[PDB]
């Protein structure tokens with residue numbers, strides 16, 4: 001019998017509707033309080049413009065005030081640092097992020113920039129201090145990066161308790177795999193982390209009651225590798241030409257969906273699974289930052 | 296026929312001899328310079344007194360100047376913060392640590408205390424900044440906690456490459472298990488982390504080509520569970536009706552290819568690694 005499909009587009013829409021109501025209610029409980037997000041951009045990349053306007057739009061629908069600071073390509077590292085410092089010190093701003101990658105004519109140390117973000121405002125969760133808190137089990141008040149956050153939410157939507165399950169994470173990146181490990185461990189799964197040097201990957205994958213794949217290797221995890229009854233979470237966004245589609249390209253996951261859907265009990269499709277969760281998760285983190293500041 | 300014994304006492308002695316020579320050479324290059332370590336203690340636990348004396352002794356044998364500050368049981372979090380601030384600002388102190396657990400009559404948030412330590416002096420590697428670097432693979436520029444560091448060194452003493460091995464870590468503490476996981480992962484093992492909520496622990500342990508145990512549960516990991524030919528690293532220090540490890544040594548030694556005894560395995564290696572981190576902090580300050 002085939003896997004239930006976790007519909008990230010519907011679940012994300014429910015999350016954004018709930019956050020809207022919560023934000024409406026925070027303002028009525030505490031009049032004048034305005035949850036506030038800022039996004040700092042360097043340069044003028046087309047892709048970043050599109051992603052930023054999606055974030056700003058979601059924030060405005062929820063009643064979060066969203067500020068976009070767009071610095072020119074001529075900007076220096078020292079000017080970027082000054083803006084980060086000013087955002088840290090601005091008590092009207094509850095959360096902010098720096099859109100990546102930076103687009104400057106000058107050399108800018110990306111890591112130093114990110115690590116100047118005050119940890120209590122780090123809504124993308126990529127500062128070293130936040131990673132360190134997450135990695136050592138302080139989940140009550142650290143920020144969680146948006147993709148693994150959405151993965152955890154998808155897993156919880158199944159209603160299957162995580163504790164005691166053997167979870168497998170394929171990938172160990174800063175943005176996905178590593179924080180995904182941390183969330184699974186502090187929800188009491190027994191966790192195996194695999195990567196490009198893992199031997200007999202198929203046999204490792206086949207031990208996962210919960211499987212999260214974040215490799216960027218299109219459809220590499222085959223249906224045969226999936227443990228029967230597993231929860232399969234697929235972070236992959238891989239482009240493949242396909243003239244039968246409206247824009248001449250299909251999106252496929254890091255998992256071979258058509259065979260994995262016959263083995264799993266719950267599976268995320270691609271497109272429509274993990275991807276649409278991500279902006280909702282940023283908004284949820286923004287709302288958490290605003291609630292903490294309200295104490 | 297038994298597993299080769301990884302003799303942490305002899306390996307640590309070699310490490311301390313090397314660090315002594317390094318320290319002697321720093322002093323001849325820069326006369327009057329003294330690497331300096333401070334250990335801040337709250338309360339008066341017997342075990343902490345003994346562990347601190349062991350650290351002081353190793354430091355003096357290497358030529359590191361070691362200072363011990365012992366605060367009373369009445370100490371408040373705010374008083375501990377004043378000493379941490381003073382140690383941060385004292386440019387004669389290259390590295391310092393806070394001995395754990397704190398022994399106070401008042402509630403003190405251990406994490407807030409540890410996280411006031413300046414990252415360049417955090418030789419125990421327990422600040423969030425250092426943990427965060429280790430946890431994400433940026434080992435260029437962080438202190439690693441002394442126990443996992445010592446465990447990695449014991450593993451390397453076998454001569455067996457870590458990359459591609461299935462490693463199992465039993466325990467996930469901030470001081471041992473979690474950082475141990477990170478060290479194994481960024482040395483390219485495939486790592487499984489177990490804890491008190493792991494089901495079928497025996498079957499998890501049995502997948503480990505490398506096994507590190509740090510539970511504080513005396514001899515709970517049974518020899519039968521060990522994969523034949525495994526490298527077994529036992530961090531346990533348990534007092535029992537003698538000191539014993541977290542592993543059932545006499546049965547595990549018949550299955551493993553390499554095993555650490557208790558006492559004389561991980562413990563001495565932990566102190567040597569603290570001294571290595573202290574010496575690195577002194578060398579960094581010298582630029």
Ligand SMILES: NC(=O)c1ccc[n+]([C@@H]2O[C@H](COP(=O)([O-])OP(=O)(O)OC[C@H]3O[C@@H](n4cnc5c(N)ncnc54)[C@H](OP(=O)(O)O)[C@@H]3O)[C@@H](O)[C@H]2O)c1
Nearest residue numbers: 147171172173175176195196214215216235236237275278
């Ligand atoms: N929807 C979203 O907004 C979103 C966000 C982030 C990422 N993603 C997608 O998720 C995927 C991965 O992204 P990322 O940021 O995690 O990428 P990444 O930084 O390139 O990480 C790739 C990870 O997968 C591992 N890997 C690669 N080949 C492997 C193999 N053959 N077997 C096992 N492990 C292998 C790599 O191992 P090593 O560590 O050994 O190199 C690494 O840990 C991509 O499709 C990306 O587009 C989606």
Ligand SMILES: NC(=O)c1ccc[n+]([C@@H]2O[C@H](COP(=O)([O-])OP(=O)(O)OC[C@H]3O[C@@H](n4cnc5c(N)ncnc54)[C@H](OP(=O)(O)O)[C@@H]3O)[C@@H](O)[C@H]2O)c1
Nearest residue numbers: 442466467468471490491509510511530531532561562565
């Ligand atoms: N030689 C050295 O220098 C040195 C240094 C530090 C520690 N140690 C020793 O190493 C041992 C562990 O120390 P620690 O600081 O890590 O202790 P700890 O904070 O008490 O943590 C114990 C860990 O083991 C897990 N655990 C407990 N019972 C278990 C069970 N039945 N099955 C599986 N996992 C179990 C715990 O699970 P939960 O997270 O689910 O609670 C926890 O993660 C102790 O004997 C300690 O004295 C030695």
Ligand SMILES: Nc1nc(=O)c2c([nH]1)NC[C@@H](CCc1ccc(C(=O)N[C@@H](CCC(=O)O)C(=O)O)cc1)C2
Nearest residue numbers: 304346349395396532558559560561562563565566
């Ligand atoms: N939280 C916490 N828990 C702990 O159990 C400890 C620390 N902190 N901090 C310090 C740490 C140090 C433990 C230690 C114990 C003993 C020795 C040592 O001198 N080795 C001796 C005895 C061997 C042994 O007991 O392992 C030897 O064989 O030469 C070295 C270090 C133990």
